[PDB]
Protein backbone atom coordinates (compact mmCIF):
# COMPACT_ATOMS: atom_id res chain seq x y z
CA UNK A 1 0.00 0.00 0.00
CA UNK A 2 1.03 3.57 -0.69
CA UNK A 3 -0.46 5.03 2.46
CA UNK A 4 1.78 4.50 5.42
CA UNK A 5 -0.95 4.07 8.02
CA UNK A 6 -2.14 0.93 6.23
CA UNK A 7 1.35 -0.46 6.52
CA UNK A 8 1.81 0.18 10.17
CA UNK A 9 -1.61 -1.20 11.03
CA UNK A 10 -0.65 -4.29 9.05
CA UNK A 11 2.60 -4.79 10.95
CA UNK A 12 0.77 -4.53 14.27
CA UNK A 13 -1.72 -7.18 13.20
CA UNK A 14 1.13 -9.63 12.72
CA UNK A 15 2.03 -9.39 16.40
CA UNK A 16 -1.55 -9.91 17.47
CA UNK A 17 -1.90 -12.98 15.28
CA UNK A 18 1.36 -14.44 16.55
CA UNK A 19 -0.06 -14.30 20.00
CA UNK A 20 -2.76 -16.77 18.82
CA UNK A 21 -1.14 -19.18 16.39
CA UNK A 22 2.33 -18.83 17.77
CA UNK A 23 5.45 -17.13 16.56
CA UNK A 24 6.80 -19.91 14.40
CA UNK A 25 4.03 -20.14 11.85
CA UNK A 26 4.01 -16.37 11.60
CA UNK A 27 7.75 -16.10 11.51
CA UNK A 28 8.30 -18.59 8.71
CA UNK A 29 5.96 -16.59 6.50
CA UNK A 30 7.67 -13.35 7.32
CA UNK A 31 11.10 -14.80 6.73
CA UNK A 32 10.05 -16.13 3.38
CA UNK A 33 8.92 -12.67 2.39
CA UNK A 34 12.44 -11.26 2.51
CA UNK A 35 13.36 -12.60 -0.92
CA UNK A 36 11.17 -9.98 -2.60
CA UNK A 37 12.89 -7.35 -4.69
CA UNK A 38 11.03 -4.17 -3.75
CA UNK A 39 12.29 -2.40 -0.67
CA UNK A 40 8.98 -1.29 0.77
CA UNK A 41 7.82 -4.85 1.18
CA UNK A 42 11.07 -5.90 2.79
CA UNK A 43 11.39 -3.01 5.20
CA UNK A 44 7.90 -3.61 6.50
CA UNK A 45 8.44 -7.36 6.82
CA UNK A 46 11.55 -6.48 8.82
CA UNK A 47 9.53 -4.29 11.17
CA UNK A 48 6.95 -7.02 11.61
CA UNK A 49 9.62 -9.55 12.53
CA UNK A 50 10.72 -7.18 15.25
CA UNK A 51 7.14 -6.60 16.38
CA UNK A 52 6.49 -10.29 16.97
CA UNK A 53 9.98 -10.70 18.44
CA UNK A 54 9.10 -8.11 21.05
CA UNK A 55 5.61 -9.31 21.87
CA UNK A 56 6.52 -12.99 21.95
CA UNK A 57 9.87 -12.73 23.73
CA UNK A 58 13.07 -12.79 21.64
CA UNK A 59 14.20 -16.27 22.56
CA UNK A 60 11.35 -17.58 20.46
CA UNK A 61 12.12 -15.80 17.17
CA UNK A 62 15.89 -15.42 17.63
CA UNK A 63 17.21 -18.83 16.50
CA UNK A 64 15.27 -18.82 13.26
CA UNK A 65 16.18 -15.25 12.43
CA UNK A 66 19.84 -15.88 13.12
CA UNK A 67 19.69 -19.03 11.03
CA UNK A 68 18.32 -17.05 8.12
CA UNK A 69 21.55 -15.02 7.97
CA UNK A 70 23.25 -17.96 6.31
CA UNK A 71 20.96 -17.92 3.25
CA UNK A 72 23.08 -16.93 0.24
CA UNK A 73 21.05 -13.95 -0.87
CA UNK A 74 21.94 -10.33 -0.25
CA UNK A 75 18.55 -8.91 0.57
CA UNK A 76 17.86 -11.63 3.10
CA UNK A 77 21.06 -10.91 4.93
CA UNK A 78 20.46 -7.18 4.93
CA UNK A 79 16.92 -7.96 6.05
CA UNK A 80 17.89 -9.98 9.12
CA UNK A 81 20.32 -7.25 10.14
CA UNK A 82 17.62 -4.63 9.66
CA UNK A 83 15.16 -6.47 11.89
CA UNK A 84 17.75 -6.90 14.59
CA UNK A 85 18.21 -3.14 14.46
CA UNK A 86 14.50 -2.62 15.06
CA UNK A 87 14.48 -5.35 17.69
CA UNK A 88 17.09 -3.79 19.88
CA UNK A 89 15.40 -0.44 19.52
CA UNK A 90 12.14 -2.02 20.69
CA UNK A 91 13.25 -4.17 23.59
CA UNK A 92 15.45 -1.55 25.20
CA UNK A 93 16.91 -2.56 28.56
CA UNK A 94 15.74 -6.11 28.09
CA UNK A 95 18.36 -6.46 25.38
CA UNK A 96 21.14 -7.11 27.81
CA UNK A 97 20.03 -10.70 27.71
CA UNK A 98 20.86 -11.23 24.06
CA UNK A 99 23.85 -9.06 23.37
CA UNK A 100 26.25 -11.95 23.79
CA UNK A 101 24.15 -13.98 21.40
CA UNK A 102 24.29 -11.51 18.56
CA UNK A 103 27.75 -10.09 19.02
CA UNK A 104 29.43 -12.64 16.68
CA UNK A 105 26.76 -12.10 14.01
CA UNK A 106 27.46 -8.40 14.01
CA UNK A 107 31.18 -8.79 13.93
CA UNK A 108 30.71 -11.04 10.93
CA UNK A 109 28.68 -8.32 9.31
CA UNK A 110 31.15 -5.58 10.12
CA UNK A 111 33.93 -7.43 8.41
CA UNK A 112 31.86 -7.78 5.32
CA UNK A 113 32.77 -6.55 1.84
CA UNK A 114 29.34 -5.00 1.14
CA UNK A 115 29.09 -1.45 2.50
CA UNK A 116 25.38 -1.84 3.22
CA UNK A 117 26.10 -4.85 5.44
CA UNK A 118 28.26 -2.45 7.42
CA UNK A 119 25.74 0.34 7.61
CA UNK B 1 -41.73 -6.46 -49.65
CA UNK B 2 -39.45 -9.45 -49.03
CA UNK B 3 -41.36 -12.41 -47.60
CA UNK B 4 -38.25 -14.52 -47.09
CA UNK B 5 -37.07 -12.01 -44.52
CA UNK B 6 -40.33 -12.05 -42.67
CA UNK B 7 -40.13 -15.80 -42.28
CA UNK B 8 -36.51 -15.53 -41.22
CA UNK B 9 -37.29 -12.88 -38.65
CA UNK B 10 -40.03 -14.91 -37.03
CA UNK B 11 -37.66 -17.87 -36.77
CA UNK B 12 -34.91 -15.75 -35.33
CA UNK B 13 -37.03 -14.09 -32.68
CA UNK B 14 -38.19 -17.50 -31.52
CA UNK B 15 -34.62 -18.82 -31.38
CA UNK B 16 -33.49 -15.97 -29.14
CA UNK B 17 -36.38 -16.52 -26.76
CA UNK B 18 -35.84 -20.23 -26.71
CA UNK B 19 -32.19 -19.85 -25.90
CA UNK B 20 -33.06 -17.71 -22.93
CA UNK B 21 -35.51 -20.38 -21.76
CA UNK B 22 -32.91 -23.11 -22.27
CA UNK B 23 -30.58 -21.12 -20.05
CA UNK B 24 -33.18 -21.39 -17.29
CA UNK B 25 -33.63 -25.16 -17.74
CA UNK B 26 -37.30 -24.95 -18.83
CA UNK B 27 -39.36 -24.36 -21.96
CA UNK B 28 -42.86 -24.29 -20.53
CA UNK B 29 -44.59 -21.26 -22.07
CA UNK B 30 -46.49 -20.16 -19.01
CA UNK B 31 -43.45 -19.67 -16.83
CA UNK B 32 -42.23 -17.35 -19.53
CA UNK B 33 -45.02 -15.14 -20.64
CA UNK B 34 -43.95 -12.45 -23.11
CA UNK B 35 -43.96 -9.79 -20.43
CA UNK B 36 -40.59 -11.11 -19.24
CA UNK B 37 -39.04 -10.55 -22.67
CA UNK B 38 -40.73 -7.45 -24.08
CA UNK B 39 -40.76 -5.29 -20.91
CA UNK B 40 -38.06 -2.58 -21.12
CA UNK B 41 -34.85 -2.80 -19.19
CA UNK B 42 -35.86 0.17 -17.07
CA UNK B 43 -38.47 -2.04 -15.44
CA UNK B 44 -36.35 -5.11 -15.16
CA UNK B 45 -37.18 -6.98 -18.30
CA UNK B 46 -34.91 -8.05 -21.02
CA UNK B 47 -36.17 -5.42 -23.35
CA UNK B 48 -36.10 -7.10 -26.68
CA UNK B 49 -37.30 -5.34 -29.73
CA UNK B 50 -39.97 -7.04 -31.68
CA UNK B 51 -40.40 -7.83 -35.28
CA UNK B 52 -41.95 -11.31 -35.31
CA UNK B 53 -45.43 -10.73 -33.97
CA UNK B 54 -46.81 -9.73 -37.35
CA UNK B 55 -49.19 -11.49 -39.64
CA UNK B 56 -47.27 -12.85 -42.62
CA UNK B 57 -48.99 -12.17 -45.92
CA UNK B 58 -49.63 -14.99 -48.33
CA UNK B 59 -51.15 -15.91 -51.62
CA UNK B 60 -51.65 -19.12 -53.57
CA UNK B 61 -48.35 -20.71 -54.48
CA UNK B 62 -48.96 -21.58 -58.09
CA UNK B 63 -49.95 -18.15 -59.13
CA UNK B 64 -47.65 -16.18 -56.87
CA UNK B 65 -44.65 -17.85 -58.37
CA UNK B 66 -45.93 -16.88 -61.78
CA UNK B 67 -46.92 -13.26 -61.29
CA UNK B 68 -47.55 -10.76 -58.55
CA UNK B 69 -51.03 -11.26 -57.15
CA UNK B 70 -52.81 -9.82 -54.18
CA UNK B 71 -52.48 -10.88 -50.59
CA UNK B 72 -55.36 -13.21 -49.98
CA UNK B 73 -54.49 -14.87 -46.68
CA UNK B 74 -52.37 -14.41 -43.60
CA UNK B 75 -50.22 -16.77 -41.60
CA UNK B 76 -49.77 -16.19 -37.95
CA UNK B 77 -46.32 -15.21 -36.87
CA UNK B 78 -45.25 -15.61 -33.25
CA UNK B 79 -47.74 -16.68 -30.62
CA UNK B 80 -49.12 -14.11 -28.26
CA UNK B 81 -52.01 -13.66 -25.95
CA UNK B 82 -54.82 -12.84 -28.34
CA UNK B 83 -55.87 -9.60 -26.68
CA UNK B 84 -52.34 -8.26 -26.62
CA UNK B 85 -50.66 -6.56 -29.53
CA UNK B 86 -46.91 -6.20 -29.39
CA UNK B 87 -45.54 -3.03 -31.06
CA UNK B 88 -43.66 -3.36 -34.35
CA UNK B 89 -40.11 -2.03 -34.78
CA UNK B 90 -40.73 -1.13 -38.43
CA UNK B 91 -43.48 1.34 -37.52
CA UNK B 92 -41.10 3.54 -35.49
CA UNK B 93 -38.78 4.11 -38.45
CA UNK B 94 -39.48 6.51 -41.27
CA UNK B 95 -39.22 5.06 -44.77
CA UNK B 96 -36.43 6.26 -47.00
CA UNK B 97 -38.71 7.85 -49.55
CA UNK B 98 -40.35 9.86 -46.83
CA UNK B 99 -36.92 10.86 -45.55
CA UNK B 100 -35.60 11.98 -48.93
CA UNK B 101 -38.63 14.13 -49.67
CA UNK B 102 -38.43 15.66 -46.23
CA UNK B 103 -34.71 16.22 -46.47
CA UNK B 104 -34.76 18.34 -49.61
CA UNK B 105 -37.71 20.36 -48.31
CA UNK B 106 -36.01 21.05 -44.97
CA UNK B 107 -32.69 22.04 -46.54
CA UNK B 108 -34.37 24.26 -49.12
CA UNK B 109 -36.20 26.07 -46.31
CA UNK B 110 -33.01 26.50 -44.32
CA UNK B 111 -31.32 28.28 -47.19
Amino acid sequence: AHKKAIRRATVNTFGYIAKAIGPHDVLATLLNNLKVQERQNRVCTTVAIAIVAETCSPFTVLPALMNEYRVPELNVQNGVLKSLSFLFEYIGEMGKDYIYAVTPLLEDALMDRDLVHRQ
Amino acid sequence: NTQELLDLLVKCENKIQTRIKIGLNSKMPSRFPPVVFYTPKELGGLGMLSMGHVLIPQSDLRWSKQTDVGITHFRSGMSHEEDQLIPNLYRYIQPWESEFIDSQRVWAEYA
Partner: protein
Protein backbone atom coordinates in the same frame (compact mmCIF):
# COMPACT_ATOMS: atom_id res chain seq x y z
CA UNK C 1 -16.13 -12.79 -64.42
CA UNK C 2 -19.38 -13.57 -66.20
CA UNK C 3 -20.43 -15.75 -63.31
CA UNK C 4 -20.22 -13.08 -60.67
CA UNK C 5 -21.86 -10.42 -62.80
CA UNK C 6 -25.32 -9.74 -64.08
CA UNK C 7 -26.33 -8.04 -67.31
CA UNK C 8 -29.88 -6.89 -67.73
CA UNK C 9 -31.44 -5.81 -71.01
CA UNK C 10 -34.39 -3.50 -71.51
CA UNK C 11 -35.80 -3.75 -74.96
CA UNK C 12 -39.03 -4.24 -76.82
CA UNK C 13 -39.20 -7.79 -75.47
CA UNK C 14 -38.02 -7.16 -71.94
CA UNK C 15 -40.15 -4.69 -70.05
CA UNK C 16 -38.29 -4.77 -66.75
CA UNK C 17 -34.91 -3.40 -65.89
CA UNK C 18 -33.22 -5.26 -63.06
CA UNK C 19 -30.14 -4.47 -61.03
CA UNK C 20 -28.42 -4.89 -57.71
CA UNK C 21 -27.03 -1.78 -56.08
CA UNK C 22 -25.67 -1.62 -52.54
CA UNK C 23 -27.63 -4.25 -50.75
CA UNK C 24 -30.86 -3.90 -52.59
CA UNK C 25 -32.53 -5.73 -55.41
CA UNK C 26 -34.17 -3.18 -57.66
CA UNK C 27 -36.59 -3.58 -60.54
CA UNK C 28 -37.71 -0.64 -62.64
CA UNK C 29 -40.92 -0.95 -64.59
CA UNK C 30 -41.80 2.03 -66.75
CA UNK C 31 -45.37 3.17 -67.01
CA UNK C 32 -45.56 2.85 -70.77
CA UNK C 33 -44.84 -0.84 -70.40
CA UNK C 34 -47.23 -1.57 -67.56
CA UNK C 35 -50.41 -3.41 -68.27
CA UNK C 36 -53.48 -1.18 -67.80
CA UNK C 37 -51.30 1.86 -66.91
CA UNK C 38 -51.74 0.97 -63.26
CA UNK C 39 -49.38 1.61 -60.41
CA UNK C 40 -49.20 -0.60 -57.37
CA UNK C 41 -49.15 1.58 -54.27
CA UNK C 42 -47.56 0.01 -51.24
CA UNK C 43 -44.40 0.40 -49.25
CA UNK C 44 -41.30 -0.56 -51.07
CA UNK C 45 -42.37 0.90 -54.34
CA UNK C 46 -40.66 4.12 -55.24
CA UNK C 47 -42.46 6.36 -57.69
CA UNK C 48 -39.96 7.87 -60.00
CA UNK C 49 -40.72 11.29 -61.41
CA UNK C 50 -39.58 12.73 -64.70
CA UNK C 51 -37.84 15.95 -63.82
CA UNK C 52 -38.74 17.88 -66.94
CA UNK C 53 -42.44 17.15 -67.27
CA UNK C 54 -43.11 16.53 -63.55
CA UNK C 55 -44.83 13.24 -64.18
CA UNK C 56 -44.49 9.84 -62.50
Amino acid sequence: QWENSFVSVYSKDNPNLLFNMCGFECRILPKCRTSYEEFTHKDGVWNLQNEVTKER
